[PDB]
Amino acid sequence: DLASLAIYSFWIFLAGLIYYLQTENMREGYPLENEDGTPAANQGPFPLPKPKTFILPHGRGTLTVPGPESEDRPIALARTAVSEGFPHAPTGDPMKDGVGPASWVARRDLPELDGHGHNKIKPMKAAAGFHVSAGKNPIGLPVRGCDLEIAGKVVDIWVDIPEQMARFLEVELKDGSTRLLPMQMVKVQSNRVHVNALSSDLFAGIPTIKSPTEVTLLEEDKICGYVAGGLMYAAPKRKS
Amino acid sequence: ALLSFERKYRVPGGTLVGGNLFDFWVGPFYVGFFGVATFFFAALGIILIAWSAVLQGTWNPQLISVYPPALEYGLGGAPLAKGGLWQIITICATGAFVSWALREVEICRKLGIGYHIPFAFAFAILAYLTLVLFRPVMMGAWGYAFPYGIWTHLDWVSNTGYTYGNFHYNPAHMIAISFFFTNALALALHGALVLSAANPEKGKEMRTPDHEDTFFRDLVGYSIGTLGIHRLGLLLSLSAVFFSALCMIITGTIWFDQWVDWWQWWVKLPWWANIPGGING
Amino acid sequence: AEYQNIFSQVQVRGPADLGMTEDVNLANRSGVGPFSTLLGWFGNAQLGPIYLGSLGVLSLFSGLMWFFTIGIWFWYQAGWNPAVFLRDLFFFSLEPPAPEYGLSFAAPLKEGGLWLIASFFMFVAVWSWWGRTYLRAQALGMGKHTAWAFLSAIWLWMVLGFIRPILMGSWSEAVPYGIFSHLDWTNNFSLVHGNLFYNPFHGLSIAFLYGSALLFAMHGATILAVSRFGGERELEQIADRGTAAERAALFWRWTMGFNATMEGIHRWAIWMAVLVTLTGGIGILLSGTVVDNWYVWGQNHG
Ligand code: BCL
Ligand code: BCL
Ligand code: BCL
Ligand SMILES: CC[C@H]1c2cc3[nH]c4c(c3C)C(=O)[C@H](C(=O)OC)c4c3nc(cc4[nH]c(cc(n2)[C@@H]1C)c(C(C)=O)c4C)[C@@H](C)[C@@H]3CCC(=O)OC/C=C(\C)CCC[C@H](C)CCC[C@H](C)CCCC(C)C
Ligand SMILES: CC[C@H]1c2cc3[nH]c4c(c3C)C(=O)[C@H](C(=O)OC)c4c3nc(cc4[nH]c(cc(n2)[C@@H]1C)c(C(C)=O)c4C)[C@@H](C)[C@@H]3CCC(=O)OC/C=C(\C)CCC[C@H](C)CCC[C@H](C)CCCC(C)C
Ligand SMILES: COC(C)(C)C/C=C/C(C)=C/C=C/C(C)=C/C=C/C(C)=C/C=C\C=C(C)\C=C\C=C(/C)CC/C=C(\C)CCC=C(C)C
Ligand SMILES: COC1=C(OC)C(=O)C(C/C=C(/C)CCC=C(C)C)=C(C)C1=O
Ligand SMILES: CCCCCCCCCCCC[N+](C)(C)[O-]
Ligand SMILES: CCCCCCCCCCCC[N+](C)(C)[O-]
Ligand SMILES: CCCCCCCCCCCC[N+](C)(C)[O-]
Ligand SMILES: CCCCCCCCCCCC[N+](C)(C)[O-]
Ligand SMILES: CCCCCCCCCCCC[N+](C)(C)[O-]
Ligand SMILES: [Fe+3]
């Protein structure tokens, strides 16, 4: 019976497809580790796939995966229990240390680049001739944190050139320096920009960028991780 | 037991109930209060199904079937062996699903991410509830709900549909179907596009998201963009289910005749109802 | 309440984006269409440019011909009366030749020949469109995943209108061009083969259709949830894993005990979707050629 054959064949094909898909999905984060960083004894029934290499544009190199994995940064956490499977308490200030929901990854300390090799993200002032085309222009608005205090004022928007979208608000603080706030973490209102994630005293602690007209993948990770971390860690000073 | 990058995220906090009491993992799985609730609901539910299987006198997975009360019980209880198990298993199911969603919320909070996922999942739960709860209640009996069995739930779909003629003519069903098909279309295209950029022709560099926009503009004159496509996939698949639930909650309540006759309202409009020729004159 | 990233709060625009050049013949690209503020609340504001070219023109002209062939036939059925046209729009139907003509091209225009002409134009419209999905990827130096995916949709289409009719020995088996009639054809197809619920390939096609919505709801929600870390910039997260891709993987590892990667989710995506119409086309192709009655087959598995 041909249909019997087809269905039986299909299920064999699907077992193979799922094996292929699961192993493809092990190109990052494996081998599994124990809480102390060493290889775990049980790696499960799926073995790592043969590595593959991505050629990165603009002379940025290649990436081969799976490859040796490491955090490449210190992790200020310690065990809270004598056996596996419990949480790890922050050893200092988890926002400053960048752990928990405040975590960042040691991504490349270069800016993401567009298909022409230009910086993907720029302050709008340096982006010819990008402008607000719809919605409330946030530039000039006071910025308020979850303590309902004013933290600073919006002085620009950083935009993704190739995708024509707003990515960050640049916010000037009381001392005259600025910080980037992710577009996804602000509520633009008629008279203010509101930030639920941070109280006003946490703005100064937002990670700074090194060059005032670009931002690197590493810097984006620190800023975003830090702002998101405020949901958990600023919660004492909020208040709605 | 941990992904190479995982430990920095396994901090305390984010739980909704119980403070630190259940704030831990078992292998990969987070627990939480709702992990315990899920296990309790699911376990009780699975035990009751096995008991239903005994009373039915079968262990075959293709035969086991747990039926809701016969229509005569209305919206009241039924002896265990005659609809009561169904009723308890349904409460367990519901408990399990809502517990799963709420565990997902605890996970979001620990990870500092948005709640989109448990929100999306709550659409699926709402659909299940439409069929086993909202619709049977509005119609006046549990027996209108589908039974829990692999082939018997399909008998229920077929029987329920053919109660109203060809169920294709349910207009809410037509919209739902359109969202399902379009969703699979968008899914294929999204998967294909990302992969085609990441895995370009032999020896070439990875394409960029600018190439992704370009390919789609070249192809059809438009590209929704990388944020937009993920907005879209979510909208399409939740819309599909919103309309699935709609299409059933209106069926047997506000509309209970043959769905194909619903369309007569349009043909019978005064200004053309009587002009001869075409199909309906 | 927190912002949810369903609709943008602020749109920005700059110079029309004319896209990447690579090996694309630029003479065949239009200029930019208008900018839709409406669209830009959800996705991109920009329309165009589009790529024209020879295959493009062929495909569009052919597709219009298919469309105009059916619509001409509909006007005829309407007796050329605009009010009857609109009244009866979903009832009209361009139907294939009767069984007696088998696979011949000998049927009269009004009784099947016109169905064949519309079908012919559809065939060249789709295939030349398929060719377009290959060629636009090629010109840009991209992989061929789009055209490989599209081919799975083509497969169910070809099975329905072309391959299954040929194997069954008549065009009468094919699908009619009409809103209501294509639905009646579908109900009928199932009734006449003993209920498609018993066709294991139909049931797989369902698992995959529902799986697509499950999966796109999962993935779309996951990306939006980590968009506050740039999660939707998926190609760069592939190249250089960020906290977005990690928080996303761990949401799922912690929920259900396994997870994907930034690249690999897109492979789960493409296969979950293409497997709908594959499985599907197989289940239909086997219907009537090898299996007359799925319920019966299911009683034997044979
Ligand atoms: C002969 C049968 C009739 C018919 C009768 C009906 C009937 C009756 C119904 C549909 C419904 C559906 N039909 Mg119909 N319909 C037919 C023809 C079709 C055709 C077609 C191509 O011909 C199509 C595409 C569809 C498509 C549609 C969908 C819009 C809809 C089903 C999806 C859904 O409800 O999801 C919603 C998703 C869920 C309900 C699942 C939720 C589950 C979640 C909460 C959890 C499960 C977890 C757990 C148990 C998993 C185990 C854990 C393990 C570890 C994995 N029908 C024919 C004409 N159709 C149904 C509908 O809209 O229902 C609302 C419906 O009731
Ligand atoms: C949605 C609208 C209709 C419906 C109409 C259809 C039709 C029509 C078909 C199915 C089919 C399926 N349906 Mg149904 N079915 C509905 C209600 C559901 C519900 C529920 C609401 O709780 C569940 C769990 C199922 C589950 C099932 C699977 C057995 C099968 C493949 C589904 C799938 O891949 O989904 C997509 C999701 C995934 C890919 C995730 C994987 C999860 C699946 C595999 C979970 C299976 C759980 C099952 C064995 C329950 C065991 C419970 C245990 C005690 C825990 N249906 C309602 C009543 N269903 C197909 C079949 O072949 O049936 C025989 C089929 O043709
Ligand atoms: C009474 C109805 C019967 C039944 C009869 C059928 C029949 C007949 C078929 C299906 C098929 C399917 N059924 Mg069923 N269906 C049943 C009940 C169900 C139920 C349910 C009860 O809940 C569900 C969910 C489904 C679900 C499904 C899908 C899984 C599947 C089609 C997938 C697809 O994406 O095709 C949609 C995608 C396509 C058609 C491919 C499109 C191809 C490309 C080339 C399009 C080109 C168009 C272009 C030219 C148009 C131009 C316009 C542009 C905008 C320019 N069926 C009942 C039992 N079902 C199909 C299948 O594969 O079955 C095995 C099928 O043939
Ligand atoms: C809303 C859009 C689509 C969608 C989205 C969606 N589903 C979701 C979620 C999302 C976003 C996830 O967060 C969640 C998930 O964790 O996925 C991996 C999930 C999920 N969707 C799932 C299944 C599923 N989703 C489905 C559909 C859909 N889900 C929609 C199409 C279907 C269909 C189409 O039939 C199924 C079968 C699970 C994989 C998962 C939720 C798992 C869960 O709740 O686990 C807790 C409960 C148990 C471990 C089992 C409980 C056992 C019961 C108490 C007894 C069984 C009773 C049951 C009623 C009997 C059914 C018998 C059948 C033969 C009918
Ligand atoms: C894998 C399974 C899913 C799938 C996959 C899929 N479909 C796809 C793709 C893939 C990956 C292709 O890349 C291809 C595509 O280009 O998508 C954008 C396609 C496609 N699937 C399409 C539709 C479609 N897919 C189907 C669904 C599915 N597709 C499955 C669910 C269905 C259903 C569910 O019935 C539909 C109807 C098209 C959008 C596209 C194929 C386009 C095509 O073949 O064109 C041929 C004909 C024309 C070019 C013109 C036709 C005539 C029009 C009626 C005229 C009106 C508009 C006209 C363009 C105006 C121009 C006027 C000018 C003169 C000014
Ligand atoms: C207002 O008036 C205007 C001018 C605007 C005209 C209006 C147009 C209208 C109202 C037309 C509407 C068209 C409709 C309703 C189309 C609907 C079609 C549907 C629902 C299609 C559904 C299924 C179609 C399938 C499965 C078709 C399969 C086709 C093939 C696989 C092609 C097979 C080719 C054949 C048989 C020819 C083979 C020839 C060779 C070369 C050997
Ligand atoms: C590969 O990802 C995808 C995009 O590519 C970047 C798209 O753009 C679209 C097209 C979506 C829409 C809203 C078309 C209708 C809008 C107009 C022009 C009126 C789909 C489906 C898609 O899957
Ligand atoms: C079609 C759905 C199938 C999904 C289940 C297959 C994957 C199971 C879990 C993979 C193992 C995770 N692990 C051990 C490698 O970490
Ligand atoms: C499926 C999406 C369909 C998109 C519609 C096509 C819009 C592109 C039109 C571009 C024409 C540019 N123009 C008018 C200046 O020549
Ligand atoms: C295919 C996408 C179509 C997009 C249409 C949706 C428009 C909704 C706009 C809502 C914006 C609300 N507002 C004023 C706060 O920006
Ligand atoms: C991308 C792979 C995901 C695989 C999902 C598999 C779902 C299994 C559903 C069983 C279908 C039953 N049957 C008899 C119709 O074949
Ligand atoms: C269809 C149900 C299958 C569920 C697939 C999920 C399996 C995850 C199991 C996690 C165990 C990992 N391990 C082996 C390292 O302990
Ligand atoms: Fe994606």
Side-chain angles (χ1 to χ4, degrees), chain B residues 46-66:
Chain B
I46 287 143
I47 288 157
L48 294 178
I49 289 163
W51 193 19
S52 181
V54 170
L55 302 168
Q56 193 183 336
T58 185
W59 275 123
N60 196 321
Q62 287 195 74
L63 304 176
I64 297 164
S65 182
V66 186

PDB file of all heavy atoms in Angstrom, chain B residues 46-66:
ATOM      1  N   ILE B  46      -4.339  14.319  34.706  1.00  0.00           N
ATOM      2  CA  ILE B  46      -3.873  13.102  34.055  1.00  0.00           C
ATOM      3  C   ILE B  46      -4.320  11.826  34.812  1.00  0.00           C
ATOM      4  O   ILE B  46      -4.588  10.798  34.196  1.00  0.00           O
ATOM      5  CB  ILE B  46      -2.337  13.130  33.834  1.00  0.00           C
ATOM      6  CG1 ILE B  46      -1.958  14.115  32.707  1.00  0.00           C
ATOM      7  CG2 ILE B  46      -1.792  11.734  33.477  1.00  0.00           C
ATOM      8  CD1 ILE B  46      -0.640  14.892  32.948  1.00  0.00           C
ATOM      9  N   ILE B  47      -4.390  11.895  36.138  1.00  0.00           N
ATOM     10  CA  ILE B  47      -4.839  10.752  36.929  1.00  0.00           C
ATOM     11  C   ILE B  47      -6.310  10.475  36.593  1.00  0.00           C
ATOM     12  O   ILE B  47      -6.690   9.321  36.316  1.00  0.00           O
ATOM     13  CB  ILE B  47      -4.657  11.012  38.447  1.00  0.00           C
ATOM     14  CG1 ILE B  47      -3.165  10.958  38.834  1.00  0.00           C
ATOM     15  CG2 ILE B  47      -5.458  10.017  39.268  1.00  0.00           C
ATOM     16  CD1 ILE B  47      -2.833  11.713  40.121  1.00  0.00           C
ATOM     17  N   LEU B  48      -7.111  11.536  36.591  1.00  0.00           N
ATOM     18  CA  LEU B  48      -8.527  11.415  36.311  1.00  0.00           C
ATOM     19  C   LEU B  48      -8.815  10.876  34.921  1.00  0.00           C
ATOM     20  O   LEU B  48      -9.764  10.110  34.747  1.00  0.00           O
ATOM     21  CB  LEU B  48      -9.230  12.732  36.552  1.00  0.00           C
ATOM     22  CG  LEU B  48      -9.224  13.132  38.022  1.00  0.00           C
ATOM     23  CD1 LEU B  48      -9.896  14.472  38.190  1.00  0.00           C
ATOM     24  CD2 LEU B  48      -9.900  12.045  38.905  1.00  0.00           C
ATOM     25  N   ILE B  49      -7.986  11.225  33.944  1.00  0.00           N
ATOM     26  CA  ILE B  49      -8.102  10.650  32.612  1.00  0.00           C
ATOM     27  C   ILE B  49      -7.817   9.156  32.652  1.00  0.00           C
ATOM     28  O   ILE B  49      -8.536   8.384  32.028  1.00  0.00           O
ATOM     29  CB  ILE B  49      -7.190  11.366  31.571  1.00  0.00           C
ATOM     30  CG1 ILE B  49      -7.725  12.767  31.269  1.00  0.00           C
ATOM     31  CG2 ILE B  49      -7.048  10.537  30.298  1.00  0.00           C
ATOM     32  CD1 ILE B  49      -6.720  13.709  30.596  1.00  0.00           C
ATOM     33  N   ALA B  50      -6.764   8.753  33.363  1.00  0.00           N
ATOM     34  CA  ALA B  50      -6.463   7.325  33.528  1.00  0.00           C
ATOM     35  C   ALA B  50      -7.615   6.570  34.242  1.00  0.00           C
ATOM     36  O   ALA B  50      -7.925   5.430  33.908  1.00  0.00           O
ATOM     37  CB  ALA B  50      -5.120   7.125  34.242  1.00  0.00           C
ATOM     38  N   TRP B  51      -8.270   7.233  35.186  1.00  0.00           N
ATOM     39  CA  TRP B  51      -9.452   6.672  35.824  1.00  0.00           C
ATOM     40  C   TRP B  51     -10.636   6.600  34.856  1.00  0.00           C
ATOM     41  O   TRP B  51     -11.385   5.605  34.834  1.00  0.00           O
ATOM     42  CB  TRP B  51      -9.849   7.494  37.037  1.00  0.00           C
ATOM     43  CG  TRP B  51     -10.845   6.817  37.900  1.00  0.00           C
ATOM     44  CD1 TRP B  51     -11.145   5.465  37.934  1.00  0.00           C
ATOM     45  CD2 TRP B  51     -11.670   7.432  38.887  1.00  0.00           C
ATOM     46  NE1 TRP B  51     -12.112   5.221  38.880  1.00  0.00           N
ATOM     47  CE2 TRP B  51     -12.456   6.406  39.482  1.00  0.00           C
ATOM     48  CE3 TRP B  51     -11.824   8.752  39.347  1.00  0.00           C
ATOM     49  CZ2 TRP B  51     -13.396   6.666  40.489  1.00  0.00           C
ATOM     50  CZ3 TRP B  51     -12.752   9.012  40.360  1.00  0.00           C
ATOM     51  CH2 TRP B  51     -13.528   7.973  40.917  1.00  0.00           C
ATOM     52  N   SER B  52     -10.817   7.658  34.077  1.00  0.00           N
ATOM     53  CA  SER B  52     -11.810   7.626  33.031  1.00  0.00           C
ATOM     54  C   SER B  52     -11.525   6.457  32.086  1.00  0.00           C
ATOM     55  O   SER B  52     -12.454   5.782  31.626  1.00  0.00           O
ATOM     56  CB  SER B  52     -11.877   8.961  32.287  1.00  0.00           C
ATOM     57  OG  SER B  52     -12.885   8.927  31.280  1.00  0.00           O
ATOM     58  N   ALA B  53     -10.250   6.178  31.841  1.00  0.00           N
ATOM     59  CA  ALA B  53      -9.881   5.102  30.932  1.00  0.00           C
ATOM     60  C   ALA B  53     -10.261   3.736  31.504  1.00  0.00           C
ATOM     61  O   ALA B  53     -10.688   2.848  30.754  1.00  0.00           O
ATOM     62  CB  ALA B  53      -8.410   5.150  30.593  1.00  0.00           C
ATOM     63  N   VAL B  54     -10.101   3.575  32.818  1.00  0.00           N
ATOM     64  CA  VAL B  54     -10.471   2.326  33.507  1.00  0.00           C
ATOM     65  C   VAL B  54     -11.990   2.058  33.377  1.00  0.00           C
ATOM     66  O   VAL B  54     -12.403   0.978  32.940  1.00  0.00           O
ATOM     67  CB  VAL B  54      -9.997   2.319  35.009  1.00  0.00           C
ATOM     68  CG1 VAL B  54     -10.598   1.144  35.774  1.00  0.00           C
ATOM     69  CG2 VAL B  54      -8.465   2.277  35.110  1.00  0.00           C
ATOM     70  N   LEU B  55     -12.792   3.072  33.713  1.00  0.00           N
ATOM     71  CA  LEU B  55     -14.248   3.013  33.625  1.00  0.00           C
ATOM     72  C   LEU B  55     -14.780   2.816  32.196  1.00  0.00           C
ATOM     73  O   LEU B  55     -15.891   2.315  31.996  1.00  0.00           O
ATOM     74  CB  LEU B  55     -14.879   4.268  34.234  1.00  0.00           C
ATOM     75  CG  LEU B  55     -14.581   4.618  35.698  1.00  0.00           C
ATOM     76  CD1 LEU B  55     -15.072   6.028  35.981  1.00  0.00           C
ATOM     77  CD2 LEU B  55     -15.186   3.607  36.696  1.00  0.00           C
ATOM     78  N   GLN B  56     -13.996   3.244  31.218  1.00  0.00           N
ATOM     79  CA  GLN B  56     -14.277   2.992  29.821  1.00  0.00           C
ATOM     80  C   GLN B  56     -13.787   1.596  29.436  1.00  0.00           C
ATOM     81  O   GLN B  56     -14.277   1.005  28.463  1.00  0.00           O
ATOM     82  CB  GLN B  56     -13.577   4.044  28.961  1.00  0.00           C
ATOM     83  CG  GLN B  56     -14.047   4.071  27.512  1.00  0.00           C
ATOM     84  CD  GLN B  56     -13.284   5.076  26.655  1.00  0.00           C
ATOM     85  OE1 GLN B  56     -12.722   6.038  27.172  1.00  0.00           O
ATOM     86  NE2 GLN B  56     -13.270   4.850  25.351  1.00  0.00           N
ATOM     87  N   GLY B  57     -12.806   1.087  30.183  1.00  0.00           N
ATOM     88  CA  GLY B  57     -12.250  -0.234  29.949  1.00  0.00           C
ATOM     89  C   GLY B  57     -11.301  -0.297  28.779  1.00  0.00           C
ATOM     90  O   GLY B  57     -11.261  -1.298  28.064  1.00  0.00           O
ATOM     91  N   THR B  58     -10.537   0.779  28.578  1.00  0.00           N
ATOM     92  CA  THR B  58      -9.489   0.796  27.559  1.00  0.00           C
ATOM     93  C   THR B  58      -8.253   1.594  27.996  1.00  0.00           C
ATOM     94  O   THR B  58      -8.364   2.525  28.790  1.00  0.00           O
ATOM     95  CB  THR B  58     -10.042   1.294  26.197  1.00  0.00           C
ATOM     96  OG1 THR B  58      -9.016   1.197  25.191  1.00  0.00           O
ATOM     97  CG2 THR B  58     -10.396   2.774  26.245  1.00  0.00           C
ATOM     98  N   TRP B  59      -7.087   1.192  27.487  1.00  0.00           N
ATOM     99  CA  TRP B  59      -5.823   1.896  27.710  1.00  0.00           C
ATOM    100  C   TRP B  59      -5.268   2.408  26.378  1.00  0.00           C
ATOM    101  O   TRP B  59      -4.341   3.215  26.362  1.00  0.00           O
ATOM    102  CB  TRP B  59      -4.778   0.994  28.398  1.00  0.00           C
ATOM    103  CG  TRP B  59      -4.876   0.938  29.916  1.00  0.00           C
ATOM    104  CD1 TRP B  59      -5.042  -0.194  30.692  1.00  0.00           C
ATOM    105  CD2 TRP B  59      -4.817   2.042  30.840  1.00  0.00           C
ATOM    106  NE1 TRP B  59      -5.105   0.142  32.024  1.00  0.00           N
ATOM    107  CE2 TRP B  59      -4.963   1.502  32.151  1.00  0.00           C
ATOM    108  CE3 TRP B  59      -4.659   3.435  30.702  1.00  0.00           C
ATOM    109  CZ2 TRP B  59      -4.950   2.307  33.305  1.00  0.00           C
ATOM    110  CZ3 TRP B  59      -4.655   4.234  31.846  1.00  0.00           C
ATOM    111  CH2 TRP B  59      -4.801   3.665  33.132  1.00  0.00           C
ATOM    112  N   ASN B  60      -5.835   1.948  25.264  1.00  0.00           N
ATOM    113  CA  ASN B  60      -5.416   2.415  23.936  1.00  0.00           C
ATOM    114  C   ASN B  60      -5.583   3.930  23.798  1.00  0.00           C
ATOM    115  O   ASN B  60      -6.670   4.448  23.987  1.00  0.00           O
ATOM    116  CB  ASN B  60      -6.204   1.689  22.850  1.00  0.00           C
ATOM    117  CG  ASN B  60      -5.582   1.820  21.480  1.00  0.00           C
ATOM    118  OD1 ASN B  60      -5.071   2.875  21.081  1.00  0.00           O
ATOM    119  ND2 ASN B  60      -5.644   0.744  20.735  1.00  0.00           N
ATOM    120  N   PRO B  61      -4.498   4.638  23.489  1.00  0.00           N
ATOM    121  CA  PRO B  61      -4.546   6.105  23.360  1.00  0.00           C
ATOM    122  C   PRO B  61      -5.480   6.562  22.229  1.00  0.00           C
ATOM    123  O   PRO B  61      -6.052   7.641  22.335  1.00  0.00           O
ATOM    124  CB  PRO B  61      -3.095   6.484  23.026  1.00  0.00           C
ATOM    125  CG  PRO B  61      -2.267   5.290  23.421  1.00  0.00           C
ATOM    126  CD  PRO B  61      -3.150   4.102  23.211  1.00  0.00           C
ATOM    127  N   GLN B  62      -5.605   5.764  21.175  1.00  0.00           N
ATOM    128  CA  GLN B  62      -6.537   6.049  20.080  1.00  0.00           C
ATOM    129  C   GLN B  62      -8.012   5.763  20.440  1.00  0.00           C
ATOM    130  O   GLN B  62      -8.905   6.145  19.686  1.00  0.00           O
ATOM    131  CB  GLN B  62      -6.142   5.302  18.803  1.00  0.00           C
ATOM    132  CG  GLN B  62      -4.916   5.894  18.137  1.00  0.00           C
ATOM    133  CD  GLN B  62      -4.722   5.410  16.708  1.00  0.00           C
ATOM    134  OE1 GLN B  62      -5.442   5.831  15.801  1.00  0.00           O
ATOM    135  NE2 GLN B  62      -3.747   4.530  16.500  1.00  0.00           N
ATOM    136  N   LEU B  63      -8.266   5.124  21.583  1.00  0.00           N
ATOM    137  CA  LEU B  63      -9.643   4.880  21.996  1.00  0.00           C
ATOM    138  C   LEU B  63     -10.106   5.658  23.218  1.00  0.00           C
ATOM    139  O   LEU B  63     -11.288   5.987  23.319  1.00  0.00           O
ATOM    140  CB  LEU B  63      -9.922   3.384  22.188  1.00  0.00           C
ATOM    141  CG  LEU B  63      -9.621   2.488  20.988  1.00  0.00           C
ATOM    142  CD1 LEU B  63      -9.851   1.049  21.394  1.00  0.00           C
ATOM    143  CD2 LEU B  63     -10.470   2.863  19.766  1.00  0.00           C
ATOM    144  N   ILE B  64      -9.199   5.946  24.144  1.00  0.00           N
ATOM    145  CA  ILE B  64      -9.574   6.648  25.382  1.00  0.00           C
ATOM    146  C   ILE B  64     -10.313   7.929  25.030  1.00  0.00           C
ATOM    147  O   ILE B  64      -9.879   8.687  24.157  1.00  0.00           O
ATOM    148  CB  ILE B  64      -8.311   6.965  26.243  1.00  0.00           C
ATOM    149  CG1 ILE B  64      -7.634   5.659  26.684  1.00  0.00           C
ATOM    150  CG2 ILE B  64      -8.659   7.867  27.454  1.00  0.00           C
ATOM    151  CD1 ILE B  64      -6.215   5.841  27.188  1.00  0.00           C
ATOM    152  N   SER B  65     -11.433   8.172  25.685  1.00  0.00           N
ATOM    153  CA  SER B  65     -12.198   9.364  25.378  1.00  0.00           C
ATOM    154  C   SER B  65     -13.006   9.768  26.570  1.00  0.00           C
ATOM    155  O   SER B  65     -13.751   8.958  27.106  1.00  0.00           O
ATOM    156  CB  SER B  65     -13.126   9.099  24.197  1.00  0.00           C
ATOM    157  OG  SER B  65     -13.831  10.273  23.878  1.00  0.00           O
ATOM    158  N   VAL B  66     -12.872  11.017  26.995  1.00  0.00           N
ATOM    159  CA  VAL B  66     -13.629  11.492  28.152  1.00  0.00           C
ATOM    160  C   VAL B  66     -14.724  12.453  27.678  1.00  0.00           C
ATOM    161  O   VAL B  66     -14.432  13.552  27.159  1.00  0.00           O
ATOM    162  CB  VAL B  66     -12.724  12.178  29.202  1.00  0.00           C
ATOM    163  CG1 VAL B  66     -13.524  12.513  30.459  1.00  0.00           C
ATOM    164  CG2 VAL B  66     -11.534  11.293  29.542  1.00  0.00           C
TER     165      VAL B  66
END
